[PDB]
Amino acid sequence: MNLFSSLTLVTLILLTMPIAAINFNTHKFTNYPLYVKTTISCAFITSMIPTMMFIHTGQEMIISNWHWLTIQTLKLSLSFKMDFFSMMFVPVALFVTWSIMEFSMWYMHSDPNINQFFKYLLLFLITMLILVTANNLFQLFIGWEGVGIMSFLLIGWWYGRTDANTAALQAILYNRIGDIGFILAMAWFLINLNTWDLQQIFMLNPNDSNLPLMGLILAATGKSAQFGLHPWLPSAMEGPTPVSALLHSSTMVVAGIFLLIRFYPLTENNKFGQSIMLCLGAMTTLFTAMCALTQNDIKKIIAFSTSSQLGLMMVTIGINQPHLAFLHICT
Amino acid sequence: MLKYIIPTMMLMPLTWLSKNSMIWINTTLHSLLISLTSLLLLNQFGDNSLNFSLTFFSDSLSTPLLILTMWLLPLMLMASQHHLSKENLARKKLFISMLILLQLFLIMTFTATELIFFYIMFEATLVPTLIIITRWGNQTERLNAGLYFLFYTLAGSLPLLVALIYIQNTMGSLNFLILQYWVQPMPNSWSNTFMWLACMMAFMVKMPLYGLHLWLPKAHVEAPIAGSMVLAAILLKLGGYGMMRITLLLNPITDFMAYPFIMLSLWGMIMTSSICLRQTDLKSLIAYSSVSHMALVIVAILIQTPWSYMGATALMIAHGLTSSMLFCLANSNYERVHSRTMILARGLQTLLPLMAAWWLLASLTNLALPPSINLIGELFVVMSTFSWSNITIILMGLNMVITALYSLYMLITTQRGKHTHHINNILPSFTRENALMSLHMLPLLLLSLNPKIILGPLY
Amino acid sequence: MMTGRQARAPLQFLPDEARSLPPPKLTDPRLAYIGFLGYCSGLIDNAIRRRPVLSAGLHRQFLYITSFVFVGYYLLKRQDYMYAVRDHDMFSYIKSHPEDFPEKDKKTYREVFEEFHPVR
Amino acid sequence: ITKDMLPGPYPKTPEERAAAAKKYNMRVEDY
Amino acid sequence: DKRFLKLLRFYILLTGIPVVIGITLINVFIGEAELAEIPEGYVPEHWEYFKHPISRWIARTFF
Amino acid sequence: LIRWTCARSANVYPNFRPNTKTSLLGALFGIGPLIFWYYVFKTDRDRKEKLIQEGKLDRTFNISY
Amino acid sequence: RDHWIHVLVPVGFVFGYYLDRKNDEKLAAFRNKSLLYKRELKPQEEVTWK
Amino acid sequence: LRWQEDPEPEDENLYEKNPDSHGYDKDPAVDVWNMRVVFFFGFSIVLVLGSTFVAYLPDYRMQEWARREAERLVKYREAHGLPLMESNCFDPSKIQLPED
Amino acid sequence: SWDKDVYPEPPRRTPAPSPQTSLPNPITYLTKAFDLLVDRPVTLVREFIERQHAKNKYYYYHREFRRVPDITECHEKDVLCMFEAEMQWKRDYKVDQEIVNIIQERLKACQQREGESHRQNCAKELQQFTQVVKAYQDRYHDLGAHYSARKCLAKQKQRMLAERKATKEAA
Numbered sequence A: 001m002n003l004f005s006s007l008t009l010v011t012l013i014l015l016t017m018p019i020a021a022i023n024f025n026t027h028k029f030t031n032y033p034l035y036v037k038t039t040i041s042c043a044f045i046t047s048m049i050p051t052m053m054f055i056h057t058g059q060e061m062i063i064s065n066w067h068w069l070t071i072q073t074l075k076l077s078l079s080f081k082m083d084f085f086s087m088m089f090v091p092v093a094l095f096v097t098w099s100i101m102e103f104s105m106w107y108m109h110s111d112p113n114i115n116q117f118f119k120y121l122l123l124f125l126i127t128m129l130i131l132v133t134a135n136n137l138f139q140l141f142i143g144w145e146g147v148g149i150m151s152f153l154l155i156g157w158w159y160g161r162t163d164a165n166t167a168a169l170q171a172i173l174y175n176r177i178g179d180i181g182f183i184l185a186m187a188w189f190l191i192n193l194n195t196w197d198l199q200q201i202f203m204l205n206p207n208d209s210n211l212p213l214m215g216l217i218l219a220a221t222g223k224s225a226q227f228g229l230h231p232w233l234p235s236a237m238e239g240p241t242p243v244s245a246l247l248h249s250s251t252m253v254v255a256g257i258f259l260l261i262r263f264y265p266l267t268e269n270n271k272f273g274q275s276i277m278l279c280l281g282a283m284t285t286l287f288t289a290m291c292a293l294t295q296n297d298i299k300k301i302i303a304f305s306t307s308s309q310l311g312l313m314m315v316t317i318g319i320n321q322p323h324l325a326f327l328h329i330c331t
Numbered sequence B: 001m002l003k004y005i006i007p008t009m010m011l012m013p014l015t016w017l018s019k020n021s022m023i024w025i026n027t028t029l030h031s032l033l034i035s036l037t038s039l040l041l042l043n044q045f046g047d048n049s050l051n052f053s054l055t056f057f058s059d060s061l062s063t064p065l066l067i068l069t070m071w072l073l074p075l076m077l078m079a080s081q082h083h084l085s086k087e088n089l090a091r092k093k094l095f096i097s098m099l100i101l102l103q104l105f106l107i108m109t110f111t112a113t114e115l116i117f118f119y120i121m122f123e124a125t126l127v128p129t130l131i132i133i134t135r136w137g138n139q140t141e142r143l144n145a146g147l148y149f150l151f152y153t154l155a156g157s158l159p160l161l162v163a164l165i166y167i168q169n170t171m172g173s174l175n176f177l178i179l180q181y182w183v184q185p186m187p188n189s190w191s192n193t194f195m196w197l198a199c200m201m202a203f204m205v206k207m208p209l210y211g212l213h214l215w216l217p218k219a220h221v222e223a224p225i226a227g228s229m230v231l232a233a234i235l236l237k238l239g240g241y242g243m244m245r246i247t248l249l250l251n252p253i254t255d256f257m258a259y260p261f262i263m264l265s266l267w268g269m270i271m272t273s274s275i276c277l278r279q280t281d282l283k284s285l286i287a288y289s290s291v292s293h294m295a296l297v298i299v300a301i302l303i304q305t306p307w308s309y310m311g312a313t314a315l316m317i318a319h320g321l322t323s324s325m326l327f328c329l330a331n332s333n334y335e336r337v338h339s340r341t342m343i344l345a346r347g348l349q350t351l352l353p354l355m356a357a358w359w360l361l362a363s364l365t366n367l368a369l370p371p372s373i374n375l376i377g378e379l380f381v382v383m384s385t386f387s388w389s390n391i392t393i394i395l396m397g398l399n400m401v402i403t404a405l406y407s408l409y410m411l412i413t414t415q416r417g418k419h420t421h422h423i424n425n426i427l428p429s430f431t432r433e434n435a436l437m438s439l440h441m442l443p444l445l446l447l448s449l450n451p452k453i454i455l456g457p458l459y
Numbered sequence C: 001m002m003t004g005r006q007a008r009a010p011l012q013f014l015p016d017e018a019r020s021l022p023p024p025k026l027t028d029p030r031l032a033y034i035g036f037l038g039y040c041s042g043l044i045d046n047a048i049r050r051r052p053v054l055s056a057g058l059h060r061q062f063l064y065i066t067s068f069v070f071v072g073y074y075l076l077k078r079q080d081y082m083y084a085v086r087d088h089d090m091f092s093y094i095k096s097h098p099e100d101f102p103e104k105d106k107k108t109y110r111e112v113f114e115e116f117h118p119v120r
Numbered sequence D: 001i002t003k004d005m006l007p008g009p010y011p012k013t014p015e016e017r018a019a020a021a022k023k024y025n026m027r028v029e030d031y
Numbered sequence E: 001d002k003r004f005l006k007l008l009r010f011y012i013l014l015t016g017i018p019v020v021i022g023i024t025l026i027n028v029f030i031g032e033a034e035l036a037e038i039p040e041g042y043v044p045e046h047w048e049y050f051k052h053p054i055s056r057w058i059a060r061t062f063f
Numbered sequence F: 001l002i003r004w005t006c007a008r009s010a011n012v013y014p015n016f017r018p019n020t021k022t023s024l025l026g027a028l029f030g031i032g033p034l035i036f037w038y039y040v041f042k043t044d045r046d047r048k049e050k051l052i053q054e055g056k057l058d059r060t061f062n063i064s065y
Numbered sequence G: 001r002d003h004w005i006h007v008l009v010p011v012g013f014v015f016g017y018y019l020d021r022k023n024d025e026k027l028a029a030f031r032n033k034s035l036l037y038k039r040e041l042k043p044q045e046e047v048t049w050k
Numbered sequence H: 001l002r003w004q005e006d007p008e009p010e011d012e013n014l015y016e017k018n019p020d021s022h023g024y025d026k027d028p029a030v031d032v033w034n035m036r037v038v039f040f041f042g043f044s045i046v047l048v049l050g051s052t053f054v055a056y057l058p059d060y061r062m063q064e065w066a067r068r069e070a071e072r073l074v075k076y077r078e079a080h081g082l083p084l085m086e087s088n089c090f091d092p093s094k095i096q097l098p099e100d
Numbered sequence I: 001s002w003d004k005d006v007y008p009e010p011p012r013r014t015p016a017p018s019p020q021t022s023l024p025n026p027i028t029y030l031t032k033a034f035d036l037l038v039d040r041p042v043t044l045v046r047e048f049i050e051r052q053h054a055k056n057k058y059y060y061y062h063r064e065f066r067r068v069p070d071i072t073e074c075h076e077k078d079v080l081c082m083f084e085a086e087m088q089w090k091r092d093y094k095v096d097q098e099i100v101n102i103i104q105e106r107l108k109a110c111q112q113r114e115g116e117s118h119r120q121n122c123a124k125e126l127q128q129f130t131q132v133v134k135a136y137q138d139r140y141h142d143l144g145a146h147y148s149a150r151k152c153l154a155k156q157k158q159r160m161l162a163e164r165k166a167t168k169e170a171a
C-alpha cells in the first residue's frame, strides 16, 4: 500500500517538476529538452512499479489526498483513481511521450522556441494524466479542458500562419460542442445521484441513464472526432509532427473513448446507448477510412487512419466490450 | 467597518498633501495597505454574519466584494497614472480623489445594514463614476455615455427609493437583519407586481439586464481605464448584491415574476456573446462580454437556489478580476497604437511575448477554464439552472461555445497572425503594465486553491 | 404636525423643559461634522479669493469653525428637544387611549401556520 | 481625419453619389 | 520581460522564503495542537478551539 | 479603416428609418425567440412541477439544488 | 518627522479600530446574557468580552 | 481657417530619456521607487502574507467543526440504534397543526 | 487517527504469498528497497518532529453549543428568541450536511473496497445512504436560497398536514 500510492504520486509530481524548472529560470538552458525527456523516461520507469504490482494482485486504490471544497453535500477532493485503466494507460502514454520527445529533440531542432514547445508538450502530458487518473467529474473536466487548451496552443504553434490558427480555433469549437454534453452529464449526475465521484455513480447504478449517456456520447463525439464532429482532427495536422504524433494520434484523441470506457458499468446496462455508440462508431470508421482512400497529404491520411481507429473503438464499446476497446487504445 | 472607512478617508489628505512626484506612490502604497487590512473581514461564521454595529455588518457575500473593491483601487492607480502623466497636478489629485471617494462609497455600500443607507451609497457611487467618465474619458461620446449611465440608473432607482420607503412604512424597518426575521410572504396582486418591479429594476439596470444594457457599451468604452476597471469589476456587482439582499422580501411572487427576465438573460447571453463575435472595437467586445457574463448572474439570482447563489457570487468575483484584466490589456495596446480597433494591431506575440502570455491567461479565464473560479461560478450556475429546467443546458452549452469563440478570436486577432507593418511604435512591455497584469491574474489563480471564501453566505 | 404644541409658548428656540434633557456633548459626532463643515467653508473661502488654501487666514478659518460649532450646538439641542417632545406626546397619547392600542396576543410559531412555497 | 471623410447618409442626387464615391476612394460606376 | 520576471520572483520569494521557513519551524518545533475534552468548569478562550498555531494566533490577535 | 469602424458603430442609428421591413425584422428577431423560449421553459416547468406535487417525478437522491 | 505623511492612513486605521472597540462597549446589553453563551464568571473576571 | 489651437503633441517614449524605465514616472528615482513600492507592498505583502492569512483562517465558517461534530452525533446514534436523521426537523409533539 | 465506528472498515484478509515459479518477483525487492531507502528515513524524521511536539504539549477543544429553544416556541416577530432559534437551526443544518457527507464517504469507500461484488456486498451502506438522503430531502430540500427555520417549519407543517390527510382518508 505504501509503495503503490507513493510511486503513483511520484509519477505526477515528477512530471510537474520541469514546469517549475522552466518557470523558475534565469539562464539559457543546458539542454532543457534533454531534461524533460530524462524526466518522462524516469516517470515511465517509476510508473511501471504500480503497474507490475497491479498485474500481481489486481491491486486498485483511490488516493483522495486533499479535501478541496464541500458544497453542502458534494465533497470535492483531489482524488486519484488507480485502477486497471490508469495502471495500463499511464505507462503507455509515458512511453509514447518519451519516444515523441526524443523524436522532438531532432525534429524541432531549428525552432528557437524549443523550450516553449517541450513545456507545452509536458503540459499536455500532465493534463492527460489528470484526465485518465481522475475520480470525480470536476477533475476529469480539468484534464479534459486542459488537453483541449494544449491542443489549441500546439496546433496554433506557428501562429503567424492563418491556417494553423484556424485549425486550432476549429478544434476548440468542436471540443466545446462536446463539452455541452459533458457538462450535461455532470449536471445529470449532480442533480440525480448527488455526486461527481465515479464510485457513487457506480454504486447507485441508475436505470434511467439515457440522457447522461447521450451527454457522454456527445462529449466523446467532440473529443474522439466521431461523425458530425470529426473534421477538426484532420485539420489538427497543421501543427508540428510531434504534436500530431503524441496528441492527435494516440494520446489526446482517445479521451472520449476513454470517457465512455470509464463509464462501462452504465453503458453495459443501456442497450440504447450501446446502439448509439455502435452506429456512430461504424459511421465514423466508414466515413473517415473512405475519405483516406484518395488523400495526398501523408499526415491527412494518417489522421483519417487514427479517426477510423477511434470509430472502431467506439464500435467495440457499442458491442459491450470496453476492455477490448481500452486494449485497442493501448495497442 | 469604521476601521476601513477612516483609512479610505485619510487617503484624501494623503493625496492632497503629497509632493507633486509622490501622489501616485503614496496612494498606491497606502491603498495596498488598506487592501492588506481588508482580510480581517474573513472572520465569518457558518450561522451568524459578522455584525459590527447598528449601521454596518458583513456576511460572506459582502466580504469578497469588499476585498475586491479595496484591492481594485491600487490597480486602478497603476493603470491610470500613465495616461494622466501630462495632466495638471490639481486635476490629477481630483482624479485620485474621485477614485478614493468611489472606494469610500462602495465599501459602505456593501456593508450597509439598513437598505435606504444602501440606496444612498448605491446612488452616491454614480457621481464619482460620472465625473471620471465625462472628465477623463478620451472621446466626444463620453458626455452621451455619462448621460446614459446616469439616466438608465436613476430611472431604475427612483422606484426603488419609493419601494424601500414603502417597506419602511409597512414592516417598520429596513434593517436587513430585522427583515431576515420579519419578512412576510408577498402574495399575487398587481400592487405586489409593481412592488417587485420597483424593488428589482434598478438592480436589473445595474447588472445590466439584456434590453436595458445599452448604457454599458458606451460607459465602459468611453471611460478611462480606471473608470472601466471600477465599472466592470465592482459597479456591475452592486446590482447582484442588491438583488441578493432584496429577493428575501420578494417571495413567493418572484417564482412567477422571474420568468420574463430569466428569458431576457438566457437569450440575451446568447445575443451579446454573438455580438462579441463581430465587434471591431476591442473595448466594446469586453463590454458586451461583461453583459454576457452578468446575464448568468441574473439567472442565478432569479432562480434562488443555493448552488445558484454560490455560483453567482463566485462568478461575480471571478468576472471582476477577469474583465478588469481584459480592459487593462486593451488599454496596454491603446497606449501604443492610439486606436481601439481590434484589427489594427495584429501579430503582437511576435513583438510582446510576455504580454501575449498575459493575453492567453486572461482569455483562458474568460472562457472559464477549470479549475478557475470563472469555471466554478459558471459550472455551479449551470448545475442550478439544469435543476431549474433541464432544457436550459442548451442555452447554457451553446453559450459556452460562443464564449470560447470570442475569447480566442480576441486572442487570435490581437496576438496572432502577421504583425502590422506600418505600426512601429510598439514599445516593449513596461514593468508597470506587467505588474498590473500579474496583480490581476495571480489572485485570480490563487483563489482556485481556496475558493470557499468567494462562495457567499450559504457555502 | 406639532404646531399646536409650540403655540402656547411661541418663538421659543429652547423652552424651559428642554433643560430637562441631556445636552449634546462637545464631542458629539454631529457637532464634529458641523465643525468639519466650518473647516470646509474656510478652505472654499480661501479658494474663491485665490489665497493659499490651508495657510492663509487661520484666524478666519478658526472663526468659521467656531461659528459653525456655535450655531450647530444649539441646532442639535433643539433637534433633541423636538424628538423628545415627539416621543413624549406619543407615549402620553398611547397611555391616555388604551382602547386604540391593545396588547396583541403574540402566538408562537407552533400555532402560527405559514404557507410553504417550494423553490424548485 | 475630419467630418467630410466619415460615412454619411444615403446619397440620392448624383453629385452626392459622386462625392461619396470620391470619399470611399473608388469609381462612381463601381460605387 | 526578463527584468519583470526576475523582480517578480525576487519580491515574491523575499517574503515567501521566510514565510515557508517560519511555517516549517512552527509545524516542527512549536507543533500542532491536540484535540481534548474540555475539563470540568473550564471555559476555553475562543482561540483555544482551533488546531493550527497560526489559526490560533489569528483568532487571538485579530478576530 | 476608421471610416469602416465608424460605419459599423456610429452611423447605424442616424441612417435608420422605422418602416415595414425593420419593424417586422425587429419583432421577428427581437421578441420572437423570447416568446418561444418563454413557452418552452414555461411548459417544461409546469409539467415538472405537476409531476413533483403528484409524487410522480423520481427525485430519490436529488438533494443538491 | 520627515515622513509624517506615512502615518495618516495607518493611524487612521488604528483610531478607526479604536472606535470599533469603543463601539462594542455600547453594544454590550446582552454580554453574558444570551441563552446560548451565558455562564458564571471566572474568578478575577468582570466581563466575558470587551 | 480655424482658430488658434496647439497642435497634437507627439507621444513620449519613456525609454528614450531612460532606457531602464519601469514605466511609472519620467524621473528615474521616482520610477524605480514606484516599482519597489508596487512590488513590495503588492507581492511581498498582500499576495504572500495574504495567501498565508487565508490559508490559516481559523475554521472559515465552522465547516471543520461541523465535520467533527457530525462525527460525534453519528457515533451517538449508530451506538444507540437511532436513525441517522429524522425526516422532521422539529419535534411533532411541539407543533399544532390547523385542524380540518 | 479516527473512530472506526463512524468510519467503519471490515477486517482485512490478505492471502499468504504462495509463489509457484522460481523467478523472484521485482515487487518484493522493491518493497525491501522502499523499506530501506524511504520508509525508515521518513520514520526517523517523523520521530524527531514528534519529539519536538512532545517537548511542548498543548490542546484545543471541540466547541459545545447548548440547545436554545427552537423556532416552534419563539413568539412571532420576537427577534431575540428567533435569532437564537435560527442560528441553532443553521448549525443543525450544517451538521446534517456533514452527516450526509459521512454517509457518502462510507458508500464510496465500500464500493471501492468491495470492488467487483460491490452491488451485493454494500447493501447496508446503500440502505443507510437511502435513509439519510430521504431524511435530508424531507427536512431541507426546496427551501430556497433564503432558507430559514420558518421555511423549514412551514415545509414540515405542510408535510404533516399531507400525512394527516392521507391517514384520515385511509381510515
Ligand SMILES: CCCCCCCCCCCCCCCCCC(=O)OC[C@H](COP(=O)([O-])OCC(O)COP(=O)([O-])OC[C@@H](COC(=O)CCCCCCCCCCCCCCCCC)OC(=O)CCCCCCCCCCCCCCCCC)OC(=O)CCCCCCCCCCCCCCCCC
Binding pocket: A009, A012, A013, A016, A017, A020, A065, A126, E012, E013, E015, E016, E017, E019, E020, E023, E024, E025, E027, E028, E031, E032, E052, H048, H051, H052, H055, H056, I041, I042, I044, I045, I048, I049
Ligand atoms: C522548502 C522550500 C519550499 C519553497 C519556498 C518558497 C515557496 C513560495 C512562497 C510561498 C509563500 C506562502 C504561501 C502560502 C502557503 C502557506 C503554507 C500552507 O498553507 O501550507 C498548507 C499545507 C499545510 O501546512 P500546515 O498546516 O502548516 O501543516 C499541517 C500539519 O498538520 C502540521 O505539519 P507537520 O508537523 O505534520 O509537518 C512538519 C513539516 C513542516 O511543514 C512544512 O514544511 C510545510 C510548510 C511548507 C509549505 C510550502 C508552500 C509553498 C509551495 C510549495 C510547493 C511548490 C514548490 C515549487 C514547485 C515544486 C514542484 C511541484 O516538516 C517537514 O516538512 C519535515 C519532513 C520532511 C519529510 C521528507 C524527508 C524525510 C526523509 C529525510 C531523510 C534524510 C535525513 C535522515 C536523518 C534525519 C535525522 C533527523 O502545507 C502544504 O501543503 C505543504 C506542501 C506540500 C504538500 C504535499 C506535497 C506532495 C503532494 C503530492 C500529491 C498531490 C499533488 C498531485 C499533483 C498531480 C499532478 C498535477
Ligand SMILES: CCCCCCCCCCCCCCCCCC(=O)OC[C@H](COP(=O)([O-])OC[C@H](O)COP(=O)([O-])OC[C@H](COC(=O)CCCCCCCCCCCCCCCCC)OC(=O)CCCCCCCCCCCCCCCCC)OC(=O)CCCCCCCCCCCCCCCCC
Binding pocket: A019, A022, A023, A024, A025, A078, A116, A123, A127, A130, A139, A142, A145, A146, A149, A150, A153, B353, B354, B355, B356, B357, B358, B360, B361, B364, B365, B369, B370, B371, B372, B373, B442, B445, B446, B448, B449, E001, E005, E008, E009, E012, E016, H047, H048, H051
Ligand atoms: C499559495 C502558494 C501557491 C503556490 C503554487 C502556485 C499556484 C498558482 C499561482 C499562479 C501560477 C501562474 C503564475 C505564472 C504564470 C504567469 C506569468 C507567466 O506566464 O510567466 C511565464 C514565466 C516563464 O516563461 P518565460 O519563458 O520566462 O517567458 C514567458 C514567455 O514570454 C511566454 O510564455 P508562454 O506563453 O510560453 O508560457 C505561458 C504558459 C501558458 O500556459 C498555458 O496556457 C497552459 C495552462 C493551461 C492549460 C493547462 C492547465 C490546465 C489546468 C490544470 C492545472 C491546475 C490544476 C492541477 C492540479 C491537478 C488537478 C486538479 O504559462 C504556464 O505554463 C504557467 C504554468 C502554470 C499555469 C497555471 C494555470 C493557468 C491557466 C489558466 C487558468 C487555469 C485554471 C486555474 C488554475 C489555477 C491553479 C492554482 O514564468 C515565470 O517567470 C514565473 C513568474 C513567477 C510565478 C509566481 C507564481 C505564484 C504567484 C502568486 C504569488 C503569491 C503566492 C506565493 C506563491 C509562490 C510560488 C512560487
Ligand SMILES: CCCCCCCCCCCCCCCCCC(=O)OC[C@H](COP(=O)([O-])OCC[N+](C)(C)C)OC(=O)CCCCCCCCCCCCCCCCC
Binding pocket: A065, A066, A067, A068, A069, A076, A077, A078, A079, A136, A138, A139, B371, B448, B449, H064
Ligand atoms: C518542495 C516544496 C514542498 C514543501 C517543502 C516543505 C515540506 C516537505 C514535505 C513534508 C510534508 C509537509 C507536511 C505535509 C503537507 C500538509 C499535509 C496536510 O494535512 O495539509 C493540509 C491540507 C490537506 O487537506 P485537509 O483535508 O487536511 O485540509 C483541507 C482544508 N479544508 C478542510 C478546509 C478543506 O492541505 C494540503 O495538503 C494542501 C496541499 C495539497 C496538495 C495538492 C495541491 C493541488 C492544487 C490544485 C489546485 C486546483 C485544484 C482544484 C480541483 C481539486 C480536485 C477536485
Ligand SMILES: CCCCCCCCCCCCCCCCCC(=O)OC[C@H](COP(=O)([O-])OCC[N+](C)(C)C)OC(=O)CCCCCCCCCCCCCCCCC
Binding pocket: B152, B155, B156, B159, B162, B163, B166, B191, B192, B194, B195, B197, B198, B201, B202, B205, B212
Ligand atoms: C429603467 C427604466 C425602467 C424602470 C422601471 C422601474 C420599475 C417599474 C415599475 C415601477 C412602478 C412605480 C413604483 C411602484 C412602487 C410600488 C410600491 C408599492 O407599495 O406598491 C403597491 C401600491 C399599492 O398601494 P398601497 O400599498 O398604498 O395600498 C394598500 C394595499 N392594497 C392595494 C391592497 C389596498 O401600488 C400603488 O399604489 C401603485 C403602484 C403602481 C404605480 C404605477 C405608476 C408608475 C408606472 C411605471 C413607471 C415605470 C418607470 C417610468 C420611467 C421610465 C423612464 C423614463
Ligand SMILES: CCCCCCCCCCCCCCCCCC(=O)OC[C@H](COP(=O)([O-])OCC[N+](C)(C)C)OC(=O)CCCCCCCCCCCCCCCCC
Binding pocket: A016, A019, A067, A126, B063, B064, B065, B067, B068, B071, B317, B321, B443, B446, B447, B449, B450, B453, B454, E052, H046, H047, H050, H051, H052, H053, H054, H055, H056, H057
Ligand atoms: C477574495 C475576494 C477578492 C478577490 C481578489 C482578491 C485580491 C486581493 C489578494 C489578497 C491576498 C490573497 C487572497 C487569496 C489567497 C488565495 C490563496 C490561498 O490562501 O490559498 C490557501 C490554500 C489553502 O489550502 P487548504 O485549504 O488545503 O489548506 C489546509 C488548511 N491548513 C493549512 C490550515 C491545514 O493554500 C494551499 O493550498 C497551499 C498548498 C501548497 C501550495 C499550492 C501547491 C499546489 C498549487 C499548484 C502547483 C502546481 C501543480 C501542477 C500544475 C502544472 C502546471 C499547470
